[PDB]
Design a protein around this ligand. Structure first.
Ligand SMILES: *[C@@H]1O[C@H](CO)[C@@H](O[C@@H]2O[C@H](CO)[C@@H](O[C@@H]3O[C@H](CO[C@H]4O[C@H](CO)[C@@H](O)[C@H](O)[C@@H]4O)[C@@H](O)[C@H](O[C@H]4O[C@H](CO)[C@@H](O)[C@H](O[C@H]5O[C@H](CO)[C@@H](O)[C@H](O)[C@@H]5O)[C@@H]4O)[C@@H]3O)[C@H](O)[C@H]2NC(C)=O)[C@H](O)[C@H]1NC(C)=O
Ligand SMILES: *[C@@H]1O[C@H](CO)[C@@H](O[C@@H]2O[C@H](CO)[C@@H](O[C@@H]3O[C@H](CO[C@H]4O[C@H](CO)[C@@H](O)[C@H](O)[C@@H]4O)[C@@H](O)[C@H](O[C@H]4O[C@H](CO)[C@@H](O)[C@H](O[C@H]5O[C@H](CO)[C@@H](O)[C@H](O)[C@@H]5O)[C@@H]4O)[C@@H]3O)[C@H](O)[C@H]2NC(C)=O)[C@H](O)[C@H]1NC(C)=O
Ligand SMILES: *[C@@H]1O[C@H](CO)[C@@H](O[C@@H]2O[C@H](CO)[C@@H](O[C@@H]3O[C@H](CO[C@H]4O[C@H](CO)[C@@H](O)[C@H](O)[C@@H]4O)[C@@H](O)[C@H](O[C@H]4O[C@H](CO)[C@@H](O)[C@H](O[C@H]5O[C@H](CO)[C@@H](O)[C@H](O)[C@@H]5O)[C@@H]4O)[C@@H]3O)[C@H](O)[C@H]2NC(C)=O)[C@H](O)[C@H]1NC(C)=O
Ligand SMILES: Nc1ncnc2c1ncn2[C@@H]1O[C@H](COP(=O)(O)OP(=O)(O)OP(=O)(O)O)[C@@H](O)[C@H]1O
Ligand SMILES: Nc1ncnc2c1ncn2[C@@H]1O[C@H](COP(=O)(O)OP(=O)(O)OP(=O)(O)O)[C@@H](O)[C@H]1O
Ligand SMILES: Nc1ncnc2c1ncn2[C@@H]1O[C@H](COP(=O)(O)OP(=O)(O)OP(=O)(O)O)[C@@H](O)[C@H]1O
Ligand SMILES: *[C@@H]1O[C@H](CO)[C@@H](O)[C@H](O)[C@H]1NC(C)=O
Ligand SMILES: *[C@@H]1O[C@H](CO)[C@@H](O)[C@H](O)[C@H]1NC(C)=O
Ligand SMILES: *[C@@H]1O[C@H](CO)[C@@H](O)[C@H](O)[C@H]1NC(C)=O
Lengths: 324, 324, 324
C-alpha cells in the first residue's frame, strides 16, 4: 500500500517529473568563433619597447573551437644556418674532437655535429653543430611573464546552436543584446550576464586560478557552454550557461612538465639575401571552448511508453510480495 | 486477437524489419584531409592587380576536419612600431593632453597611450598611442568582396573510414573512380555524383545561401558526410552521402555580429632592418567537415534477445486485458 | 534447474562480474599537448645543405589534439606576381593566341590568362597566365623523401584527464616519473613503458607501416590513449594504454590520391620592396591523438537495480517453461 502509492506515485514524480520522461529529447549542434582583443607592452633585453596585438599573440589566428593566447616568451633573434657550439650538457660536453662524431644527430641535441669539439666558453668545450645559430640560451621563462598585460585581454565568443528535431535555432548573442552593448560590455555575473565578451583574467580567476602565476609557464583553460533547454517553457529561457575549468595541472604534486609551450619562428631575407630567423619559445594559455546541451519538449509517446514501463513495477510490487 | 497479431506481428515489422533489431551495430571511425584549388584576381587601392592562390587564401594551410577560405579583406600595409593618433571615437577623442593618461591601456583601444592629445585630423583630436602604425582605417568590408572569384574554387575532400567490429575499411574515393576522373570531375548530383571535388559555390548554394552575399562578411558552412551501411547488402552500397548546411546565422533578425573574420599579419624586415607588418582583417567561410555513420550487419544474438523482449508484450496484451 | 542455476548464477557472473553491473560509470574528460623534437638535414638542388628543426617542420606550430610532421617537399623559390607560361597540359597547350581567352580562369589552372599563347619551351606553347611565377615544376616527390631523418624524431605527448563523478584527476606523466627520466627516456614496451615520449618511427612501425615509404607521399597516423579504470582497484592501475593505427590508406588497391600534402608559403620583401614568395608543396604525416576511457566504481544502486532486472528472467525461466 505504502509501497503501492510509493511506486505508482513514484514513476510519476521520479521519472516523469524529475527525469522528464514525458519529453522527446535532442542534443545540441554547435559552432563557435572567437576574437580576442587587447594590447600588451613589453620592454625586454633587448628587443626594446614593443607592443603585441591580436595578430602578434594569437598563434595561429584561427582554430575551430579554441584559441591560444601568448603569455610568456623566450626569443632568439638573428638566427641563420651556420655552425655553433651546442649548449653545455652531459651529452654535449667534450675534450677531444673524437667525442663528437660528424653527422651525429640525436633528437634532443642542438643540431647536426661536424664533429669538432669547440669552445662554448673559456671554461667549457662542446660539440660543434650545424644549426640555426645562435642557439637558444638555456634559461627560465621570465617571471613576471612578458605578456602579463594579457590578463586584461577580452574575448568575444560567438556561438551558434541548433536542435534539429525541434527546428530550433539560437545564438549566444541574445535577442535583448544589440550592437552598442557589444561596443562596451564585458561579461559579469552581476552587471553584464548576457555579455559574451569575457575578460581572460576573469575566466581563469573564476576557475580559481591565478593568471599571473599561470602565465609564466602557460596552461590550458576550459570554457564550457551548456545549452540545456526545456522547450515547453518559453524560448527566452534556453540561454547558454558558462563554466570555467582548468584542464591541465591534473597532478600538481609534480614539478614535471608544467604548462604549455611550443616553438615557432619568423623568417626574413637579409642583405645578402640569405635567410635569418627569429625563434620564439612561446608560453601561453590555450582556451578551449566546449559546447554541450540537451533540449526536451513535450511528447505523448514517451509519456505513454514510460507509463507502460511504469506500471510493470506497480503490479509486481504486491505481486512480488507473494512471489517469494 | 487484432491486438495479438498486431503486437506479435509488430515486433517483427517495427523492431526487426524497420528498426533492424536483428543487426549488430557499429559507429564509424573517420578521418579527412582537404585541398582547395583555384585562383582569385583582385585590383585594389592600392596593392594593384594581384592573384591569390591556395597558399594565399587558406589560413592556416592545414586543419583537422575543416578549412578556411578567405573571401573579403581589409588590408593595412607598412605598419611599424611607432606612435600615432587613435581612430576618432567617443573613448578616443580629446581636447586636453590631460584626457589621455600615459600608459593607459584598454582592451578596445588602438594601443598604449603616451598620453598626449594629438591631431587625428584638422577637425578632430585623439589620444596618441604607441602601436603598429598606421592604424587600420575604419570602414565597411568591400562589397562586392575582393575574393568573389572564390565562389568558383574547388575542394577535394578525401575521407577514410573504418568500422572496427566489421573490419570494414572504405574511402570516399570510390572503387569505380580513377586518377583521370579526378583530373577533371567536379561533384554534381546529376552527372558527377562520385566526384569528391566540390565547387564552393555549389556547396553554399545547395545550402540555399548566396556565396557573394555571404562572402562580404564571411560565415560558417557545414559539410556532412553520412556513411550509413547495411553490411548485409553488397559493400558497393555503403557509399558516403553529402549534405550541406549553414552553421552560423542562427538569429538572422540581428544585425549584431554577422559572419566570420579574424586578423593576421605578415612580417618583414626593412632597409634599416626594423620590422614592418601587413595586417589583414580577413573575412571568409570556414568549411567544417563532419562525418557520421552507423553500420549494421546480421547477427543471431540481437535477433534472439529482441524476440525475448518482443514476446514479453505479446503475452501481457491479452494477459493485461484481464490484469486490470 | 540447470536453467535455473544457469540464469540466477548467470546474472551474477555475466552482468555483475564480467560486465561489472555493480559499478557506477563515467567517461573521461581529456586534454593533450604535444612537442616534437629532432633535426633533419637536407641537401637539395639547390637550396644546398640545410637543417630543419621543430619550427621548420611542424605546420602549424600548435593544434589541439594533433600535430603534423613534414616528411617530403617540393620547393619553388623566388616567386613573384608576374606573367609566365602555364605547365604543358591538354588544357594548357596552344597554337593560336585565340586558344587562350584573356581573363580565363579555371580552378585547375596555373593562373589568370592574358591570354597570349607563348612558348613554354622550344617544343611546346602554352597559355600565358598572371601568377606567382616561376610556376611549380611538375615532378614526383623525392624518393627517398627529403625529411627521412624525421623517422628518428621524438614527440612528448602530455595528457591530462579527469572523471568528474569520481573527482578523479590524473596525467599520463605517472607519479613514478620525474624530470630526469624525461631528460633521457624514449617510450619502449620493454624498457621504458612509462615514458610518454615516442619515436615517430616506432609509432608508425608498431602500426605495421614503413616510415620511409609512408614519408614519400605522407599519410595519417592515429595515436590512441585508452584510460580504462576500475576505481575499486588502487589508483596506481588506471594508467593510460597506447595503440597506434594508420588512419588513411583504407583502399590500398587504389593508386588514386595517396597520402597527405598541402601547399604553404613564406613571404619576403625584396630590394625594390616587392613581394617574393617561397612555395612549398609539403608532404608529411598528421599524427592524430585520440583519448577514450571509462571509469567504474562500486555502487550499491546499480547492484540492486541490476538484480531486480536479473531475477525477472530467473523466475520466468521455469514460469515460461509452462507459459508456452
Ligand atoms: C541594447 O541592449 C542592452 C542590453 O540588453 C540594453 O541595455 C538594457 O537597457 C535597459 C533599459 O534601457 C536597462 O534597464 C534597467 O532598468 C533598471 C530600472 O529601470 C527603472 O529606472 C527608472 C528610474 O526612473 C524607474 O522609474 C523604472 O522602474 C525604470 O524601469 C535599472 O536599475 C538598470 O540599471 C543598472 O542595474 C543593473 C544591475 O542589476 C545593471 O545590469 C545595469 O548595467 C548596465 O549599465 C551599466 C552602467 O550603469 C553598464 O556598466 C553595463 O554595461 C550595463 O549597460 C545597470 O547597472 C537598467 O537601467 C538594462 O539594465 C540594460 N541592460 C544592460 C546590462 O545594459 C539596451 O537598452 C539596448 N539598447 C537599445 C537601443 O535597445
Ligand atoms: C575512371 O572512372 C570514371 C568514373 O567512374 C569512368 O567514367 C565512366 O565510364 C563509363 C564507361 O566508360 C561511362 O559509362 C556511361 O555509359 C552510358 C551508356 O553507355 C552506352 O553507350 C553505348 C553507345 O554506343 C551503348 O551502345 C551501350 O549501352 C553503352 O554502354 C553513357 O550514356 C554515359 O555518358 C553520360 O551520361 C551520364 C549522365 O547520366 C554522365 O554521368 C556521364 O558523365 C561523364 O561524361 C561527361 C561528359 O560527357 C563528363 O562531364 C563527366 O565528368 C563524366 O565523365 C555522361 O554525361 C557513360 O558513357 C560513365 O558515364 C563514366 N562515369 C563518369 C561520370 O565519367 C571511367 O571510365 C574510368 N576510366 C577508366 C580508364 O576506367
Ligand atoms: C625517476 O623516475 C625513474 C623512472 O621511474 C626512476 O627510474 C627507476 O629507478 C628504479 C630504482 O632506482 C629502477 O629499479 C630497477 O631495479 C631493478 C632491480 O634492482 C635491484 O638491483 C639490485 C642489485 O644490487 C638488487 O640487489 C635489488 O633487487 C635491487 O632492487 C633493475 O633490474 C632495473 O634495471 C633495468 O631493468 C629494466 C628492464 O626490465 C629497465 O626498465 C631499466 O631501464 C632503465 O635503465 C636503462 C639503462 O639501464 C635506461 O635505458 C632506461 O631509460 C631506464 O632508465 C633497466 O634496464 C632497475 O634498476 C627502475 O628500473 C627505474 N625505471 C626506469 C625505467 O628508469 C628513477 O629512479 C627516478 N629518479 C629518482 C631520483 O627517483
Ligand atoms: N575580444 C573582444 N573584446 C571586446 N570587444 C569585441 C571583441 N571582439 C569583438 N568585439 C566587438 O563586438 C562587436 C562585434 O564583433 P565582430 O567581430 O562581429 O565585429 P567587427 O566589426 O569585426 O569587430 P572589430 O572590427 O572591432 O574587430 C564589434 O563592435 C567588436 O568591436
Ligand atoms: N581542390 C581541388 N580541385 C580540383 N582538383 C583537385 C583538387 N585537389 C586535388 N585535385 C586533383 O585530384 C587528384 C588527386 O589529388 P592529390 O592532392 O592527392 O594529388 P596531388 O598530385 O597532390 O595534386 P596536385 O599536385 O594537383 O595538388 C590530383 O590530380 C589533383 O590535381
Ligand atoms: N619531443 C620530445 N623529445 C624528447 N624530449 C622532450 C620532447 N618534448 C619535451 N621533452 C623533454 O621533456 C621535459 C619536459 O618537457 P617540457 O616541454 O614540459 O619542458 P621544456 O623546458 O619546455 O622542454 P624544452 O625546453 O627542452 O623543449 C623537458 O626536459 C624536455 O626537454
Ligand atoms: C645578426 O648577425 C650577425 C652575424 O651574422 C651578428 O653579429 C649581429 O649581432 C646580428 N644582429 C642582430 C639582428 O642582433
Ligand atoms: C612605409 O613607411 C613610410 C614611413 O615609414 C611611409 O611614408 C611610406 O608611404 C610607406 N610605404 C608603403 C609601403 O606604402
Ligand atoms: C629571383 O628572381 C630573378 C628574376 O626576378 C631570377 O632571375 C633569379 O634567378 C631569382 N633568384 C633566386 C633567389 O633564385
Amino acid at each position: 500500500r505504502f509501497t503501492q502509492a510509493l511506486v505508482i506515485a513514484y514513476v510519476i514524480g521520479y521519472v516523469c517529473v524529475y527525469n522528464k520522461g514525458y519529453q522527446d529529447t535532442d542534443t545540441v549542434l554547435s559552432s563557435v568563433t572567437t576574437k580576442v582583443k587587447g594590447i600588451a607592452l613589453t620592454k625586454t633585453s633587448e628587443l626594446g619597447e614593443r607592443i603585441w596585438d591580436v595578430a602578434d599573440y594569437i598563434i595561429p589566428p584561427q582554430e575551430d573551437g579554441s584559441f591560444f593566447v601568448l603569455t610568456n616568451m623566450i626569443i632568439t633573434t638573428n638566427q641563420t644556418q651556420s655552425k655553433c657550439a651546442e649548449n653545455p650538457t652531459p651529452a654535449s660536453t667534450c675534450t677531444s674532437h673524437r667525442d663528437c662524431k660528424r653527422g651525429f644527430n640525436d633528437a634532443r641535441g642542438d643540431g647536426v655535429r661536424t664533429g669538432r669539439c669547440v669552445s662554448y666558453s673559456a671554461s667549457v668545450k662542446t660539440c660543434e653543430v650545424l644549426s640555426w645559430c645562435p642557439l637558444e640560451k638555456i634559461v627560465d621563462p621570465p617571471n613576471p611573464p612578458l605578456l602579463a598585460d594579457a590578463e586584461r585581454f577580452t574575448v568575444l565568443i560567438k556561438n551558434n546552436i541548433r536542435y534539429p528535431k525541434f527546428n530550433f535555432n539560437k545564438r549566444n548573442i541574445l535577442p535583448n543584446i544589440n550592437s552598442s552593448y557589444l561596443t562596451h560590455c564585458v561579461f559579469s555575473r552581476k552587471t553584464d550576464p548576457d555579455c559574451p565578451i569575457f575578460r581572460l583574467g576573469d575566466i581563469v580567476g573564476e576557475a580559481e586560478e591565478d593568471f599571473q602565476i599561470m602565465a609564466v609557464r602557460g596552461g590550458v583553460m576550459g570554457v564550457q557552454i551548456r545549452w540545456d533547454c526545456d522547450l515547453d517553457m518559453p524560448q527566452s529561457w534556453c540561454v547558454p550557461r558558462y563554466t570555467f575549468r582548468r584542464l591541465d595541472n591534473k597532478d600538481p604534486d609534480n614539478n614535471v612538465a608544467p604548462g604549455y609551450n611550443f616553438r615557432f619562428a619568423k623568417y626574413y631575407k637579409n642583405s645578402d639575401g640569405t635567410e635569418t630567423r627569429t625563434l620564439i619559445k612561446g608560453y601561453g594559455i590555450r582556451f578551449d571552448v566546449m559546447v554541450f546541451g540537451q533540449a526536451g519538449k513535450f511528447n505523448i509517446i514517451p509519456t505513454l511508453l514510460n507509463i507502460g514501463a511504469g506500471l510493470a513495477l506497480l503490479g509486481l510490487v504486491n505481486v512480488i510480495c507473494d512471489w517469494i
